[PDB]
Amino acid sequence: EWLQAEIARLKGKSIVPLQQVKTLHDWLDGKRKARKSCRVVGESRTGKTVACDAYRYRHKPQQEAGRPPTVPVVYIRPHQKCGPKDLFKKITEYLKYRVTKGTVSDFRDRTIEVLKGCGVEMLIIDEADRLKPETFADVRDIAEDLGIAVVLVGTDRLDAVIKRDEQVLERFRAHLRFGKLSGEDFKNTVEMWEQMVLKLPVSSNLKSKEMLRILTSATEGYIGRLDEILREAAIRSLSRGLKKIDKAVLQEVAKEY
Amino acid sequence: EWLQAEIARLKGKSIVPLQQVKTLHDWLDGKRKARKSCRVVGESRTGKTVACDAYRYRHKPQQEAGRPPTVPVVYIRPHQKCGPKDLFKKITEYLKYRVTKGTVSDFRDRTIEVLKGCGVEMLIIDEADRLKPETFADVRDIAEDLGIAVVLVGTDRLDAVIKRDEQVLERFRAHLRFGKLSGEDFKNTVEMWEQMVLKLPVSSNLKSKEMLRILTSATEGYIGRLDEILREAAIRSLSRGLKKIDKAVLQEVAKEY
Amino acid sequence: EWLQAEIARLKGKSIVPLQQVKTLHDWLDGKRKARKSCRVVGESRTGKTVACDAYRYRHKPQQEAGRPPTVPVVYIRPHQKCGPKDLFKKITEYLKYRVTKGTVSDFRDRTIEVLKGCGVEMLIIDEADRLKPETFADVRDIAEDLGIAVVLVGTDRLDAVIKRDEQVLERFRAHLRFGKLSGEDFKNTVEMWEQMVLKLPVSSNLKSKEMLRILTSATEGYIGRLDEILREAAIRSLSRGLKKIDKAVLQEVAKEY
Amino acid sequence: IEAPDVKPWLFLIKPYEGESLSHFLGRFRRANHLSASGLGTLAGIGAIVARWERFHFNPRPSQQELEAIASVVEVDAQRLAQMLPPAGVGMQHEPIRLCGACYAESPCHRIEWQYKSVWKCDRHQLKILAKCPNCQAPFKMPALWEDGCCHRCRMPFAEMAKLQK
Amino acid sequence: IEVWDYEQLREEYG
Amino acid sequence: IEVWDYEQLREEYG
Ligand SMILES: Nc1ncnc2c1ncn2[C@@H]1O[C@H](COP(=O)(O)OP(=O)(O)OP(=O)(O)O)[C@@H](O)[C@H]1O
Ligand SMILES: Nc1ncnc2c1ncn2[C@@H]1O[C@H](COP(=O)(O)OP(=O)(O)OP(=O)(O)O)[C@@H](O)[C@H]1O
Ligand SMILES: Nc1ncnc2c1ncn2[C@@H]1O[C@H](COP(=O)(O)OP(=O)(O)OP(=O)(O)O)[C@@H](O)[C@H]1O
Ligand SMILES: [Mg+2]
Ligand SMILES: [Mg+2]
Numbered sequence: 022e023w024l025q026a027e028i029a030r031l032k033g034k035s036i037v038p039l040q041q042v043k044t045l046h047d048w049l050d051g052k053r054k055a056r057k058s059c060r061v062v063g064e065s066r067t068g069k070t071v072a073c074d075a076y077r078y079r080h081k082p083q084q085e086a087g088r089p090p091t092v093p094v095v096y097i098r099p100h101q102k103c104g105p106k107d108l109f110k111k112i113t114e115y116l117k118y119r120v121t122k123g124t125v126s127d128f129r130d131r132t133i134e135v136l137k138g139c140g141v142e143m144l145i146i147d148e149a150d151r152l153k154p155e156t157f158a159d160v161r162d163i164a165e166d167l168g169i170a171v172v173l174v175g176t177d178r179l180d181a182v183i184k185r186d187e188q189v190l191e192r193f194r195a196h197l198r199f200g201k202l203s204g205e206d207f208k209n210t211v212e213m214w215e216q217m218v219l220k221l222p223v224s225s226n227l228k229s230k231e232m233l234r235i236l237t238s239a240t241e242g243y244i245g246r247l248d249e250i251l252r253e254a255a256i257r258s259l260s261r262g263l264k265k266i267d268k269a270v271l272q273e274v275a276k277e278y
Numbered sequence: 279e280w281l282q283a284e285i286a287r288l289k290g291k292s293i294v295p296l297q298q299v300k301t302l303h304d305w306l307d308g309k310r311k312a313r314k315s316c317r318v319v320g321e322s323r324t325g326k327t328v329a330c331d332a333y334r335y336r337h338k339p340q341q342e343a344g345r346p347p348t349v350p351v352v353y354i355r356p357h358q359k360c361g362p363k364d365l366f367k368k369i370t371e372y373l374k375y376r377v378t379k380g381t382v383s384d385f386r387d388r389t390i391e392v393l394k395g396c397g398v399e400m401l402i403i404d405e406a407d408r409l410k411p412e413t414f415a416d417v418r419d420i421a422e423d424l425g426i427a428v429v430l431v432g433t434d435r436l437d438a439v440i441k442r443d444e445q446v447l448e449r450f451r452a453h454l455r456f457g458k459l460s461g462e463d464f465k466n467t468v469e470m471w472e473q474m475v476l477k478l479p480v481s482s483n484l485k486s487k488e489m490l491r492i493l494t495s496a497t498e499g500y501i502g503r504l505d506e507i508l509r510e511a512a513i514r515s516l517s518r519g520l521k522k523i524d525k526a527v528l529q530e531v532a533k534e535y
Numbered sequence: 536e537w538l539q540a541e542i543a544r545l546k547g548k549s550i551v552p553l554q555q556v557k558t559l560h561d562w563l564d565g566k567r568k569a570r571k572s573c574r575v576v577g578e579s580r581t582g583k584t585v586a587c588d589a590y591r592y593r594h595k596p597q598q599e600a601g602r603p604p605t606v607p608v609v610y611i612r613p614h615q616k617c618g619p620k621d622l623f624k625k626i627t628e629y630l631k632y633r634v635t636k637g638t639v640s641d642f643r644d645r646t647i648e649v650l651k652g653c654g655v656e657m658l659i660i661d662e663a664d665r666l667k668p669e670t671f672a673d674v675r676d677i678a679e680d681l682g683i684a685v686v687l688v689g690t691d692r693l694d695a696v697i698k699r700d701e702q703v704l705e706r707f708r709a710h711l712r713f714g715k716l717s718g719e720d721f722k723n724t725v726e727m728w729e730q731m732v733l734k735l736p737v738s739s740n741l742k743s744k745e746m747l748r749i750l751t752s753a754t755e756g757y758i759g760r761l762d763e764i765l766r767e768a769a770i771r772s773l774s775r776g777l778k779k780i781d782k783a784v785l786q787e788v789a790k791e792y
Numbered sequence: 793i794e795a796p797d798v799k800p801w802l803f804l805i806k807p808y809e810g811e812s813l814s815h816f817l818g819r820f821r822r823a824n825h826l827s828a829s830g831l832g833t834l835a836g837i838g839a840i841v842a843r844w845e846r847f848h849f850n851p852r853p854s855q856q857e858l859e860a861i862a863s864v865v866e867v868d869a870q871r872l873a874q875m876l877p878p879a880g881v882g883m884q885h886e887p888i889r890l891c892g893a894c895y896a897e898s899p900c901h902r903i904e905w906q907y908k909s910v911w912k913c914d915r916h917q918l919k920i921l922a923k924c925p926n927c928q929a930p931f932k933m934p935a936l937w938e939d940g941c942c943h944r945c946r947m948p949f950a951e952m953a954k955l956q957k
Numbered sequence: 958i959e960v961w962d963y964e965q966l967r968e969e970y971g
Numbered sequence: 972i973e974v975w976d977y978e979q980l981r982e983e984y985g
Contacts, residue, residue, distance in 0.1 A: 082985035596971035
């Protein structure tokens, strides 16, 4: 069924090279060669996790016939109230080697062995504020011991955690911030999203003045909402046999937000 | 004894289709296919928990002789001050999976393995505000990691808890609200309850103006009160050898509330 | 429907260049470069708040790829019995940072960090007399510590509050005063409003003596009343199929004030 | 209350022909995420099962731990019995021998390789490894194998089969 | 002279 | 411009 094929697509995910994303990739590269640690901050729906993920994938791990994989970038995400053991365990799994059973000092010794030899240039920690305050001792330790850049990614709260300790604030003083959509940038996005993500047969033509008012109020500049809203509108719309997104169905969706 | 058979019936429980209930079932279905998380809000006697049951039962789990089941909908209720360990344990038990002692990270790894493979599309969490603030990290994690819609069900306080954290507010921004009975809807309900639930040989003829006044003042539109009150009135009334509900016996019951 | 288009227009809001407004814009600019604090005073319907917005909008925030917006002018309006945390909270939100849980010293230290880096030259506080007496300590502190001009806007009551404290009166001693319309200025305004705001086909000749008497008594020179009255008069008048404002219909409206 | 018309269950695996016991139990523990003590606990047979993973079998508790455990792994006592050397024969211990040539067919370990008399594979016709050819380390119990990867010297394990014979 | 719509100034804001 | 599917990157992963 043609309709079923299309609904499954719309329910999925994709990466669109937005203006905000291009900047981060170049900034991190600077930091990568310079081998310096830094942090990235911004509001929770700005798409920080995605920009950082897209980056990870542009540097495929490499493999020769003999030695272990060389893995320039490591991306991990902690659990809530992450302890010192939990951080090493995830780094070790990420790199495909598993050590089971021992004490904290053993996970640490083993983490430094897999981080060495195997080239690692950058470690990215998502939701950095899930880290328990003491774990930063182990994050600094690695950052200073090995020539590995460490990047901390998070919301404004992350800085509230960092500013409570001078030892950390100073290693991670440099920062980049993500912002929101506005003005001409919000409009250009909307148009890209229509052609690049929705793809209905009949042009729904949203950049029109009358329609942008609806979207602006509904989304308030967060790329997160903009995506959810236009996808929910094409899916609802197709389920009812329409060939485009109109004004009333868009309002029907926006009303629920 | 004929009379005893009848008292036992009245003492029990049943589900009556109502408009409130139908609305939810269709709304959730939208959300299920779209795979989007949401919340349901409303006052505590509107019958939210019961609508959720009625929903669960419309999708029979399937099972083959050897491999694991397919369970499209999972419904759980937390205990007060629910922690991260308590949530995983209840998810794992609801599927009749055998498990014992281990640490929090171990229940977490297990929760993702039983949620995977086993078709699960939606998770519904009742009494949602019993969750401790940190557990929401685990609720978001699942919602983002697995294509599972999470529905939070609760009273106005639920939103007071949610607004304390921007990370949660945004995943669960869309909502549906349950309301109270009024006007013609309260009147039609009362009538349904007489024909579909009470069933006395003597015919009550409740919808009468002078009787609805009694019930309206007594119940203030809550379906909860309406049910308890008419059932307490038929049981008391039968025990006294009457064949119908009159005005005085109804007032005798309502006076106690 | 032609008439409906017109009613919606009249129902709305606009800003008309006027002498009072231009005067302020130039005065503030002097103060902005000089970096000096001051206050703006005048009666409650002179249109102080509007001139201030008209000013804000002529200086749009600027944005680079990485760092926070550069924001030359910050405009805030306090709630009633505004405390020290309420002032910092609004300054911080205005610049689009999220405020999290902490104590008074934290809001203060954080406010000074976002006021730095982000170029800020002027802070405008509307309805200044909603401030609790102690908060003025924080308003002076900023004005003296950072090269930021602070402007206090308000009615004659503001000065009655300010004279209760020498320390404040003296930092904010310079002022500009808004007045009322009269003579040729009231007459020219009326005419501007007719050609620039009302635009009925007929041309109602308000500047005629017979109409100015009605408006003068009705408005007493406040730009606020003049606008409300002529808009209520053109809207009522159109609904009745007339294309100009006559004597009786204007008196019908004026009598209600 | 919990969902209707279901029974208690866990994740099952299928044995391969010739598969060894230590190996089998390891797959099982991994599929279901648990400790050996854990298996012993669901089972109610004590801590005794952990040394099975490193091939120590003083007994054949054929009607005790072994008849009983079938109910957890869903494999019958006899198929399970077959995962150990017949009473009186076989019984090798320290080196763990392997023929990587068969790994192209199925990752596994074949228990026959640990009977005392073996040094060659007849099915693939060749010298059996008793030690790693590159890093020259001995191998870890079949029971603890991960993804067919060598920690000492990562390779495809299967990729090693062109060499040594 | 130019006169501005009040909601337009809002829409064009930074 | 190139745009990527989200799961594709995983299918082509190192
Ligand atoms: N380049 C992009 N293309 C399409 N969608 C994007 C893009 N960037 C972000 N998104 C949207 O953001 C969502 C992914 O999460 P997001 O990028 O907000 O991570 P995040 O901002 O780090 O979240 P949080 O900070 O709350 O953990 C997706 O639902 C997607 O619609
Ligand atoms: N569809 C229905 N059919 C029959 N009875 C119903 C129905 N919906 C609600 N009720 C009545 O409501 C009661 C169930 O509790 P109800 O859902 O009203 O409160 P609740 O929302 O579960 O409370 P809380 O949200 O505080 O847990 C039952 O006793 C039943 O008589
Ligand atoms: N330049 C202008 N263009 C159009 N309308 C104006 C203008 N100036 C003032 N007004 C009218 O006056 C009103 C704005 O009042 P405003 O709040 O700016 O004065 P205020 O003295 O600050 O009032 P308050 O002291 O109560 O805050 C509007 O409703 C508007 O109709
Ligand atoms: Mg994220
Ligand atoms: Mg309930």
